[PDB]
Design an enzyme around this catalytic site. Structure first.
Site, PDB file in Angstrom:
ATOM      1  CD  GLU A   1      -2.972  -0.642   2.495  1.00  0.00           C
ATOM      2  OE1 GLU A   1      -4.128  -1.120   2.482  1.00  0.00           O
ATOM      3  OE2 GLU A   1      -2.513  -0.010   3.475  1.00  0.00           O
TER       4      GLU A   1
ATOM      5  CG  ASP B   1      -4.522   8.085   7.471  1.00  0.00           C
ATOM      6  OD1 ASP B   1      -4.890   8.773   6.494  1.00  0.00           O
ATOM      7  OD2 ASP B   1      -4.213   6.879   7.379  1.00  0.00           O
TER       8      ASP B   1
END
Length: 244
Positions: A36, A47
């Site tokens: 990723e 996040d």
């Protein structure tokens, strides 16, 4: 998109620089089932603290969108390991959806994950992705219900990505509960981003049905600490998490 039992590294592009990012990828490739690659964004509201700071670092050092295709293209010269690009919608909407997907496809990207893709655009996005040869990856959190999981699984061509904001240092019940629920519903493979950081986390999650385990925070922590010299330290953390 990856083998069962896969460990999936997540790195932020341009943290500390696109060159070091490439080095890290090439160094962790031998342990990775997939990778990723995150595109730094000004407002990474989805996040956790660790990844948020890598976004800030990357940007501060002056990272620019297409610098991500450079990383992939170069990486491709050496490896064919599946690569998933993770990003916020803003960069893509502003830079033309189809155009971005096409360019990404040429750079060697296999799938894409758009953290905040407006449901209002999901369909059109998935179709354009299919036309451009990019597999889709959708996210689900502990608060995603059974009905949404189904809809998510139906639009997913790459794999379903389960996350846990919670952090930890034990994996929260709520995260295991999400995996459990995702397994009774998803036909696509599922990978988990629950902030692992111990060998028991990897063993447990795999045992509990996770097709692949993502490893980001643990790696990004090291990178924000060692800079360009984080390479060998990353190798050890991954080996520890792998039991080797």
């Amino acid at each position: 998109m990856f083998k069962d039992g896969s460990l999936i590294p997540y790195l932020t592009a341009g943290d500390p620089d696109k060159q070091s990012t490439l080095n890290f990828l090439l160094a962790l490739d031998e342990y990775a089932g997939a990778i990723e690659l995150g595109i730094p964004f000004s407002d990474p509201i989805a996040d956790g603290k660790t990844i948020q700071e890598s976004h800030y670092r990357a940007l501060k050092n002056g990272f620019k969108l297409r610098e991500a295709f450079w990383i992939v293209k170069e990486f491709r010269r050496h490896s064919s390991t599946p690569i998933v690009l993770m990003t916020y919608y803003n960069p893509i909407y502003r830079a033309g959806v189809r155009n971005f997907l096409a360019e990404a496809k040429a750079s060697g990207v296999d799938g894409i994950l758009v953290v905040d893709l407006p449901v209002f655009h999901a369909k059109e996005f998935t179709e354009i992705a299919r036309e451009e040869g990019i597999k889709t990856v959708f996210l689900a959190a502990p608060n995603t219900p059974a009905e949404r999981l189904k809809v998510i699984d139906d639009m997913t061509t790459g794999f379903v990505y389960l996350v846990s904001l919670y952090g930890t240092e034990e994996i929260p019940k709520t995260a295991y509960d999400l995996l459990r629920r995702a397994k009774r519903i998803c036909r696509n493979k599922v990978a988990v981003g629950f902030g692992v950081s111990k060998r028991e986390h990897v063993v447990s999650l795999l045992k509990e049905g996770a097709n692949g385990v993502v490893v980001g925070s643990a790696l990004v922590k090291i990178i924000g600490e060692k800079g360009r010299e984080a390479t060998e330290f990353l190798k050890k953390k991954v080996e520890e998490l792998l039991g080797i």
